[PDB]
Amino acid sequence: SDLNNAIQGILDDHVARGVVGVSLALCLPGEETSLYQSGYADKFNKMPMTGDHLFRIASCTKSFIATGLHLLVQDGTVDLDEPITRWFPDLPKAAQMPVRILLNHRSGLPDFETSMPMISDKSWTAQEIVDFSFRHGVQKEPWHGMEYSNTGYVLAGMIIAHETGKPYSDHLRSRIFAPLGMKDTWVGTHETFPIEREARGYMHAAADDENPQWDVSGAGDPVDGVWDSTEWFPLSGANAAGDMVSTPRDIVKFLNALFDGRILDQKRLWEMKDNIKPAFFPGSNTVANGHGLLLMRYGSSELKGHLGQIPGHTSIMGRDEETGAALMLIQNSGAGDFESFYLKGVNEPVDRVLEAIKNSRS
Ligand SMILES: [Ba+2]
Ligand SMILES: [Ba+2]
Ligand SMILES: [Ba+2]
Ligand SMILES: [Ba+2]
């Protein structure tokens, strides 16, 4: 179709900017999911990117952890409005922290991500990450305003574990991946995934990587302008804040079912997507968030989903509630700085795709 060719052209144009590769899944109302790729999964072996290549979805994990939590609310064992002192009696300020603030980025919790060594072999514990966060991050007052919080999601994972007596991967697998037939999806902290199937991630030695967001000491020298950063960072370190591995295909499966009401009941779905306040994420298109979902604006279209940044894999997922479209675009180029083209520029092909869909519909 004309749309197919337009979208493929958009992806080709983006890799021609110097992005190594890109993998997209797009489902449109009344249609099957279409997959599109451009560029390479492996820069040095020149392996073509396919729709079967696995990616670290980074913070897109947060939407699944939110879903897991909202499901335990459905089971009647968790109340979104009850204090987390029940699970974390000694966590500073926990009495002023309802369950919902763990998901909505207004907890004021100290964060770990900017302090955590990215290049290491360290197997992290959830409690260890929380401890690490309080040691090195700055705590604000609950409800101070919106500041993106990874710690809130690590804590959410700990509730899931405590209320199910098992790792949070079990709950997510049994309640989300299995019933939806997501066969190429893993939870990195608690599951082994086939590394050989994963697209390589590339950090670029770019001029606009001025203010890096991660401690990337120990990187060595760049080869052909990049570092292979695929296996730099322990997924256990990201934990419930960003440890998942998946394919665009599988992510669109999840998104379709979530917004079709086949995972969460109507109240819990509303909590996730519609009970929103303003939200900011540097370099992104984010304008608002609910309880597991970011609202990201692309001119006259909007996605309800999430962004993901983990060294070398840069992801945008979401559903356009107006048009009914669901997408996951992941590139295997990144940088450290939020404002780098290699990070923030992932929003450009997403923007173009949505306007191509819109024009095909005019
Ligand atoms: Ba600097
Ligand atoms: Ba390592
Ligand atoms: Ba509009
Ligand atoms: Ba037209």
Side-chain angles (χ1 to χ4, degrees):
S1 60
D2 280 353
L3 188 58
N4 289 167
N5 300 155
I7 293 174
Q8 190 62 57
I10 289 156
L11 297 188
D12 294 337
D13 288 339
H14 189 61
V15 300
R17 291 282 306 269
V19 174
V20 177
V22 63
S23 179
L24 170 70
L26 179 68
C27 185
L28 294 161
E31 312 186 8
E32 292 293 332
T33 302
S34 289
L35 311 177
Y36 299 87
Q37 314 81 32
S38 186
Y40 298 110
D42 193 319
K43 178 177 165 49
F44 299 106
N45 284 132
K46 289 202 172 88
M47 298 304 301
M49 183 72 77
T50 74
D52 287 335
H53 284 286
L54 307 184
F55 289 89
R56 295 160 294 146
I57 70 174
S59 280
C60 293
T61 297
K62 292 192 171 63
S63 303
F64 292 81
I65 288 297
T67 308
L69 197 51
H70 290 307
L71 257 23
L72 286 169
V73 172
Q74 282 182 25
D75 299 354
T77 182
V78 167
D79 187 328
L80 283 186
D81 290 302
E82 78 181 295
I84 66 189
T85 36
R86 166 175 166 186
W87 303 274
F88 321 105
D90 299 323
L91 184 101
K93 310 186 189 309
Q96 303 103 71
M97 291 192 204
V99 167
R100 64 171 69 256
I101 49 84
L102 292 181
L103 307 181
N104 76 356
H105 301 295
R106 292 172 173 263
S107 65
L109 286 165
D111 210 70
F112 59 90
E113 197 183 342
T114 199
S115 301
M116 187 174 280
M118 286 295 105
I119 307 154
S120 90
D121 285 323
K122 175 164 177 45
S123 303
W124 287 87
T125 259
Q127 184 57 61
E128 183 171 14
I129 290 164
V130 175
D131 287 336
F132 190 83
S133 300
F134 277 89
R135 191 152 43 250
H136 303 86
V138 182
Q139 187 162 30
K140 288 195 179 76
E141 302 294 319
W143 301 113
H144 64 94
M146 186 279 175
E147 185 176 355
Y148 194 84
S149 174
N150 294 304
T151 306
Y153 278 86
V154 172
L155 289 176
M158 293 172 76
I159 299 185
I160 291 163
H162 187 259
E163 299 295 304
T164 62
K166 280 185 264 201
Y168 63 76
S169 56
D170 282 1
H171 179 61
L172 269 48
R173 184 162 295 288
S174 75
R175 300 290 283 276
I176 305 154
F177 317 155
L180 306 180
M182 298 166 73
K183 279 166 158 300
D184 306 313
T185 299
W186 295 266
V187 177
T189 300
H190 306 293
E191 301 183 330
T192 293
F193 69 93
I195 339 75
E196 75 279 356
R197 279 212 260 163
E198 186 187 355
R200 299 270 105 201
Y202 297 99
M203 287 279 282
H204 280 75
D208 61 5
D209 198 11
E210 284 190 75
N211 313 118
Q213 72 176 284
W214 300 301
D215 174 6
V216 289
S217 52
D221 295 21
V223 189
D224 208 328
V226 300
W227 293 266
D228 185 332
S229 58
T230 313
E231 291 156 67
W232 265 10
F233 172 42
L235 303 179
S236 68
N239 197 267
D243 73 358
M244 277 175 67
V245 171
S246 192
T247 59
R249 190 169 35 235
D250 271 23
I251 296 295
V252 174
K253 295 190 189 197
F254 168 74
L255 294 175
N256 283 328
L258 179 70
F259 289 90
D260 278 342
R262 289 154 42 214
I263 312 173
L264 253 35
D265 70 20
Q266 199 182 313
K267 180 55 182 301
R268 261 54 65 155
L269 177 60
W270 175 87
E271 281 293 3
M272 207 182 268
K273 70 180 192 84
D274 288 304
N275 196 12
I276 59 177
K277 287 177 166 74
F280 177 81
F281 189 94
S284 79
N285 293 43
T286 305
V287 291
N289 73 272
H291 297 88
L293 288 167
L294 306 184
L295 172 59
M296 309 173 293
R297 199 159 278 153
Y298 296 88
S300 57
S301 317
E302 280 161 25
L303 293 180
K304 287 261 182 79
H306 228 283
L307 63 92
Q309 306 171 344
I310 195 158
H313 285 353
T314 311
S315 67
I316 298 293
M317 71 168 187
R319 143 96 44 143
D320 188 332
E321 293 190 297
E322 295 189 283
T323 74
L327 66 81
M328 174 48 136
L329 186 146
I330 318 165
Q331 63 191 46
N332 60 340
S333 285
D337 187 322
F338 298 119
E339 293 277 355
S340 175
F341 166 74
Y342 291 104
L343 243 38
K344 106 179 227 198
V346 74
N347 298 290
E348 299 174 7
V350 174
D351 206 346
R352 312 223 158 76
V353 167
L354 287 172
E355 55 186 46
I357 292 166
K358 181 132 175 149
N359 283 121
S360 83
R361 271 169 144 257
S362 58

